[PDB]
Design a protein around this motif. Structure first.
Motif, PDB file in Angstrom:
ATOM      1  N   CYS A 183       3.540   4.930  -9.127  1.00 54.92           N
ATOM      2  CA  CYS A 183       3.737   6.142  -8.326  1.00 54.92           C
ATOM      3  C   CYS A 183       2.374   6.719  -7.933  1.00 54.92           C
ATOM      4  N   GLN A 184       2.125   6.890  -6.631  1.00 57.52           N
ATOM      5  CA  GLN A 184       0.863   7.545  -6.209  1.00 57.52           C
ATOM      6  C   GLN A 184       0.974   9.066  -6.311  1.00 57.52           C
ATOM      7  N   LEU A 185       0.077   9.693  -7.061  1.00 51.98           N
ATOM      8  CA  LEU A 185       0.069  11.153  -7.259  1.00 51.98           C
ATOM      9  C   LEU A 185      -0.860  11.775  -6.220  1.00 51.98           C
TER      10      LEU A 185
ATOM     11  N   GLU B 213       4.661   5.714  -1.723  1.00 52.49           N
ATOM     12  CA  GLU B 213       4.199   6.850  -0.956  1.00 52.49           C
ATOM     13  C   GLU B 213       3.569   7.899  -1.864  1.00 52.49           C
ATOM     14  N   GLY B 214       2.613   8.646  -1.318  1.00 51.68           N
ATOM     15  CA  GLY B 214       2.067   9.786  -2.048  1.00 51.68           C
ATOM     16  C   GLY B 214       3.159  10.749  -2.500  1.00 51.68           C
ATOM     17  N   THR B 215       3.042  11.218  -3.738  1.00 54.42           N
ATOM     18  CA  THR B 215       4.107  11.996  -4.385  1.00 54.42           C
ATOM     19  C   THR B 215       3.518  13.281  -4.923  1.00 54.42           C
TER      20      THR B 215
ATOM     21  N   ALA C 179       0.840  -1.199   0.000  1.00 58.46           N
ATOM     22  CA  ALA C 179       0.000   0.000   0.000  1.00 58.46           C
ATOM     23  C   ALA C 179       0.877   1.252   0.000  1.00 58.46           C
ATOM     24  N   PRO C 180       0.368   2.345  -0.542  1.00 59.54           N
ATOM     25  CA  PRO C 180       1.124   3.626  -0.529  1.00 59.54           C
ATOM     26  C   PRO C 180       1.264   4.120   0.892  1.00 59.54           C
ATOM     27  N   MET C 181       2.480   4.458   1.288  1.00 63.21           N
ATOM     28  CA  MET C 181       2.713   4.990   2.649  1.00 63.21           C
ATOM     29  C   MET C 181       3.733   6.102   2.660  1.00 63.21           C
ATOM     30  N   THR C 182       3.262   7.261   3.058  1.00 59.51           N
ATOM     31  CA  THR C 182       4.092   8.432   3.374  1.00 59.51           C
ATOM     32  C   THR C 182       5.032   8.136   4.540  1.00 59.51           C
ATOM     33  N   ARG C 183       6.341   8.290   4.300  1.00 70.31           N
ATOM     34  CA  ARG C 183       7.348   8.020   5.312  1.00 70.31           C
ATOM     35  C   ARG C 183       8.260   9.203   5.575  1.00 70.31           C
TER      36      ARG C 183
ATOM     37  N   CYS D 135      -8.464  -4.251  -2.283  1.00 71.90           N
ATOM     38  CA  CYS D 135      -8.992  -3.866  -0.974  1.00 71.90           C
ATOM     39  C   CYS D 135      -7.880  -3.550  -0.013  1.00 71.90           C
ATOM     40  N   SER D 136      -8.174  -2.697   0.956  1.00 77.66           N
ATOM     41  CA  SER D 136      -7.175  -2.203   1.864  1.00 77.66           C
ATOM     42  C   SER D 136      -7.823  -1.763   3.184  1.00 77.66           C
ATOM     43  N   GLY D 137      -7.075  -1.958   4.293  1.00 74.80           N
ATOM     44  CA  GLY D 137      -7.403  -1.423   5.621  1.00 74.80           C
ATOM     45  C   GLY D 137      -7.637  -2.582   6.587  1.00 74.80           C
ATOM     46  N   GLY D 138      -6.675  -2.808   7.443  1.00 75.07           N
ATOM     47  CA  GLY D 138      -6.800  -3.793   8.521  1.00 75.07           C
ATOM     48  C   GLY D 138      -6.594  -5.218   8.080  1.00 75.07           C
ATOM     49  N   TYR D 139      -6.168  -5.477   6.832  1.00 73.87           N
ATOM     50  CA  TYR D 139      -5.969  -6.865   6.424  1.00 73.87           C
ATOM     51  C   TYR D 139      -4.772  -7.488   7.142  1.00 73.87           C
TER      52      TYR D 139
ATOM     53  N   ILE E 270      -4.007   7.506  -8.723  1.00 75.40           N
ATOM     54  CA  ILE E 270      -4.588   8.784  -8.314  1.00 75.40           C
ATOM     55  C   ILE E 270      -5.010   8.648  -6.846  1.00 75.40           C
ATOM     56  N   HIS E 271      -4.413   9.457  -5.955  1.00 79.73           N
ATOM     57  CA  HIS E 271      -4.843   9.503  -4.538  1.00 79.73           C
ATOM     58  C   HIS E 271      -6.123  10.323  -4.431  1.00 79.73           C
ATOM     59  N   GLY E 272      -7.268   9.637  -4.413  1.00 77.53           N
ATOM     60  CA  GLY E 272      -8.565  10.289  -4.227  1.00 77.53           C
ATOM     61  C   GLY E 272      -9.183  10.024  -2.882  1.00 77.53           C
TER      62      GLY E 272
ATOM     63  N   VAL F   4      -6.877   4.035  -9.398  1.00 73.67           N
ATOM     64  CA  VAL F   4      -7.579   5.093  -8.694  1.00 73.67           C
ATOM     65  C   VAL F   4      -7.893   4.625  -7.290  1.00 73.67           C
ATOM     66  N   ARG F   5      -7.573   5.436  -6.283  1.00 73.67           N
ATOM     67  CA  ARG F   5      -7.810   5.102  -4.876  1.00 73.67           C
ATOM     68  C   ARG F   5      -8.820   6.043  -4.255  1.00 73.67           C
ATOM     69  N   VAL F   6      -9.845   5.472  -3.596  1.00 72.71           N
ATOM     70  CA  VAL F   6     -10.870   6.282  -2.919  1.00 72.71           C
ATOM     71  C   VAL F   6     -11.216   5.659  -1.585  1.00 72.71           C
TER      72      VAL F   6
ATOM     73  N   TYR G 196      -1.373  -4.067   1.836  1.00 78.01           N
ATOM     74  CA  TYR G 196      -0.937  -4.024   3.227  1.00 78.01           C
ATOM     75  C   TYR G 196      -0.060  -2.813   3.418  1.00 78.01           C
ATOM     76  N   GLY G 197      -0.371  -2.039   4.466  1.00 83.11           N
ATOM     77  CA  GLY G 197       0.405  -0.875   4.807  1.00 83.11           C
ATOM     78  C   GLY G 197       1.300  -1.143   5.991  1.00 83.11           C
ATOM     79  N   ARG G 198       0.727  -1.005   7.190  1.00 85.44           N
ATOM     80  CA  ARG G 198       1.568  -1.047   8.385  1.00 85.44           C
ATOM     81  C   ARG G 198       2.404  -2.312   8.510  1.00 85.44           C
ATOM     82  N   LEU G 199       1.832  -3.501   8.177  1.00 89.28           N
ATOM     83  CA  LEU G 199       2.649  -4.713   8.267  1.00 89.28           C
ATOM     84  C   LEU G 199       3.831  -4.676   7.318  1.00 89.28           C
TER      85      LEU G 199
HETATM   86  C1  LIG Z   1       2.577   5.806   7.924  1.00 90.86           C
HETATM   87  C2  LIG Z   1       1.421   5.701   6.941  1.00 90.86           C
HETATM   88  C3  LIG Z   1       1.453   6.489   5.826  1.00 90.86           C
HETATM   89  C4  LIG Z   1       0.414   6.407   4.898  1.00 90.86           C
HETATM   90  N1  LIG Z   1       0.532   7.163   3.760  1.00 90.86           N
HETATM   91  C5  LIG Z   1      -0.431   7.025   2.765  1.00 90.86           C
HETATM   92  C6  LIG Z   1      -0.243   7.628   1.500  1.00 90.86           C
HETATM   93  O1  LIG Z   1       0.796   8.279   1.166  1.00 90.86           O
HETATM   94  N2  LIG Z   1      -1.238   7.439   0.561  1.00 90.86           N
HETATM   95  C7  LIG Z   1      -2.385   6.714   0.827  1.00 90.86           C
HETATM   96  O2  LIG Z   1      -3.234   6.595  -0.074  1.00 90.86           O
HETATM   97  N3  LIG Z   1      -2.534   6.090   2.031  1.00 90.86           N
HETATM   98  C8  LIG Z   1      -1.549   6.213   2.949  1.00 90.86           C
HETATM   99  N4  LIG Z   1      -1.688   5.511   4.130  1.00 90.86           N
HETATM  100  C9  LIG Z   1      -2.837   4.550   4.254  1.00 90.86           C
HETATM  101  C10 LIG Z   1      -2.270   3.142   3.908  1.00 90.86           C
HETATM  102  O3  LIG Z   1      -2.037   3.060   2.506  1.00 90.86           O
HETATM  103  C11 LIG Z   1      -3.234   1.994   4.261  1.00 90.86           C
HETATM  104  O4  LIG Z   1      -4.442   2.178   3.519  1.00 90.86           O
HETATM  105  C12 LIG Z   1      -3.595   1.941   5.756  1.00 90.86           C
HETATM  106  O5  LIG Z   1      -2.421   1.921   6.549  1.00 90.86           O
HETATM  107  C13 LIG Z   1      -4.615   0.833   6.172  1.00 90.86           C
HETATM  108  O6  LIG Z   1      -3.993  -0.411   5.817  1.00 90.86           O
HETATM  109  P1  LIG Z   1      -3.167  -1.361   6.898  1.00 90.86           P
HETATM  110  O7  LIG Z   1      -4.196  -1.883   7.941  1.00 90.86           O
HETATM  111  O8  LIG Z   1      -2.673  -2.467   6.004  1.00 90.86           O
HETATM  112  O9  LIG Z   1      -2.122  -0.550   7.501  1.00 90.86           O
HETATM  113  C14 LIG Z   1      -0.676   5.580   5.071  1.00 90.86           C
HETATM  114  C15 LIG Z   1      -0.749   4.840   6.262  1.00 90.86           C
HETATM  115  C16 LIG Z   1       0.291   4.889   7.199  1.00 90.86           C
HETATM  116  C17 LIG Z   1       0.206   4.081   8.494  1.00 90.86           C
END
Ligand SMILES: Cc1cc2nc3c(=O)[nH]c(=O)nc-3n(C[C@H](O)[C@H](O)[C@H](O)COP(=O)(O)O)c2cc1C
Ligand SMILES: NC(=O)C1=CN([C@@H]2O[C@H](COP(=O)(O)OP(=O)(O)OC[C@H]3O[C@@H](n4cnc5c(N)ncnc54)[C@H](OP(=O)(O)O)[C@@H]3O)[C@@H](O)[C@H]2O)CCC1
Ligand SMILES: NC(=O)C1=CN([C@@H]2O[C@H](COP(=O)(O)OP(=O)(O)OC[C@H]3O[C@@H](n4cnc5c(N)ncnc54)[C@H](OP(=O)(O)O)[C@@H]3O)[C@@H](O)[C@H]2O)CCC1
Length: 355
Positions: free
Chosen positions: A96-98, A54-56, A21-25, A289-293, A175-177, A227-229, A312-315
């Motif tokens: 690349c996530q915009l 990560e979002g860009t 998953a896209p993650m801003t760090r 799908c995304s969130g809490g998997y 697209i980050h929507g 596209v992400r919403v 998967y994001g946090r994992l």
């Molecule tokens: C540190 C961090 C940064 C994130 N940055 C973005 C981001 O840049 N773009 C985005 O669409 N979602 C971002 N998210 C949301 C994650 O992509 C993901 O949807 C979310 O963490 C829920 O999934 P998880 O339970 O697998 O962590 C971020 C989440 C975290 C924890």
């Protein structure tokens, strides 16, 4: 394990369904991708695996976090090319996530300290506070509501950023929507208080995302556009009175863009805080799908037809080899939230160990 069955995401043959998953760090110091990003994405890349950055930033006014990368300058393109090359050397596919934050910004993140832009002049409420470059939390300011010429120029910033991503070698863009950022500030009736053609009705509220998607599809081809919403996530005062109808209206516009262009988007990616399956069943194409998997929940999502890919994001922050650990059913390692958004190129970024 159905997460390890291959899947064809339009032109891309994926070997498994576990997505980063896209993650801003916040390690892209001064908005320039750094060598540390190369190490981080290389660690998580797998042969036939799909990664989303990560979002860009799409423009100098698009940021609301410190040290996030851009892709609007040629210097940023050159530095991203080095990261894309190391991921492609592992056989992975990377988009690349915009990302434009709209009103979720601060003068410290804007050129000349100017007000951030949005659909509206209302600020995010003080229920929410913005992370500052020094690690404190600040106050979201009042944004400036943009007119339709400026809307069309933001659309152009997405178009030019998508072309720059292809120049850096990315396989496509997302697209980050989601999450109460600029596009969601137009989508959500809790935010969009406009009386022109981009406000009121559900159709008018969907115009901005439709125009963004149409511009990037025209520039790089629909098969390179995801596209992400997040219709049901209410972050940053971004609620809708009818999340399911808003989601289905977006899906309808995506289906119409595909029918008109004669081509399918890479995917629709929905992140959640029955709604999910309803949006998936309405969309003509690939669903992420995304969130809490977790391992078991992602296996179930694919086995029961709820999604084609699972992000998967946090994992993935703390398990660079998350794909292999899911394959082996090996125990996963905890993540440290304190280092999610710090600037160190190693600590809490590339120093989580492999199995
Ligand atoms: C540190 C961090 C940064 C994130 N940055 C973005 C981001 O840049 N773009 C985005 O669409 N979602 C971002 N998210 C949301 C994650 O992509 C993901 O949807 C979310 O963490 C829920 O999934 P998880 O339970 O697998 O962590 C971020 C989440 C975290 C924890
Ligand atoms: N660029 C994004 O889309 C971001 C989304 N994020 C989402 O914002 C929300 C809040 O994130 P957090 O890291 O500030 O703390 P929290 O997950 O609410 O505890 C979450 O839903 C998260 O998934 C993190 C911040 C960046
Ligand atoms: O009205 P016009 O300015 O011609 O089109 C606005 C947007 O709707 C697009 N569009 C034009 N008709 C359609 C259509 N029936 N379905 C879905 N999109 C369309 C049209 O795409 P093209 O210009 O044909 O690429 C454009 O992106």
């Amino acid at each position: 394990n159905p997460l390890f069955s291959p899947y064809k995401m339009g032109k891309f043959n994926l070997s498994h369904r576990v997505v980063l998953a896209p993650m801003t760090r916040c390690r892209a110091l001064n908005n320039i991708p750094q060598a540390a990003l190369g190490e981080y994405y290389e660690q998580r890349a797998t042969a036939g695996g799909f990664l989303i950055t990560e979002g860009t930033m799409i423009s100098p006014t698009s940021a609301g976090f410190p040290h996030v990368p851009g892709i609007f300058t040629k210097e940023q393109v050159r530095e991203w090319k080095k990261i894309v090359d190391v991921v492609h050397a592992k056989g992975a596919v990377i988009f690349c996530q915009l990302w434009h934050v709209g009103r979720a910004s601060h003068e410290v993140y804007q050129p000349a300290g100017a007000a951030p832009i949005s659909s509206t002049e209302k600020p995010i409420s003080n229920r929410w506070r913005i992370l500052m470059p020094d690690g404190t939390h600040g106050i979201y300011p009042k944004p400036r509501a943009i007119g339709t010429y400026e809307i069309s120029q933001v659309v152009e910033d997405y178009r030019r950023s998508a072309l720059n991503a292809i120049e850096a070698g990315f396989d496509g863009i997302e697209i980050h929507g989601a999450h109460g950022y600029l596009i969601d500030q137009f989508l959500k009736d809790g935010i969009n208080d406009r009386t022109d053609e981009y406000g009121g009705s559900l159709a008018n509220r969907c115009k901005f995302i439709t125009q963004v998607v149409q511009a990037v599809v025209s520039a790089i081809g629909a098969d390179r556009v995801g596209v992400r919403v997040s219709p049901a996530i209410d972050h940053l005062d971004a609620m809708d009175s009818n999340p399911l109808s808003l989601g289905l209206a977006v899906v309808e516009r995506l289906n119409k863009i595909q029918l008109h262009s004669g081509s399918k988007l890479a995917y629709l990616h929905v992140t959640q805080p029955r709604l999910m399956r309803t949006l998936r069943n309405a969309y003509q194409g690939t669903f992420i799908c995304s969130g809490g998997y977790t391992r078991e929940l992602g296996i179930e999502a694919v086995a029961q037809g709820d999604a084609d890919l699972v992000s998967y994001g946090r994992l993935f922050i703390s398990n660079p080899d998350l794909v292999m650990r899911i394959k082996l059913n090996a125990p996963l390692n905890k993540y440290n939230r304190k280092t999610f958004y710090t600037q160190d190129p190693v600590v809490g970024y590339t120093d989580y160990p492999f199995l």
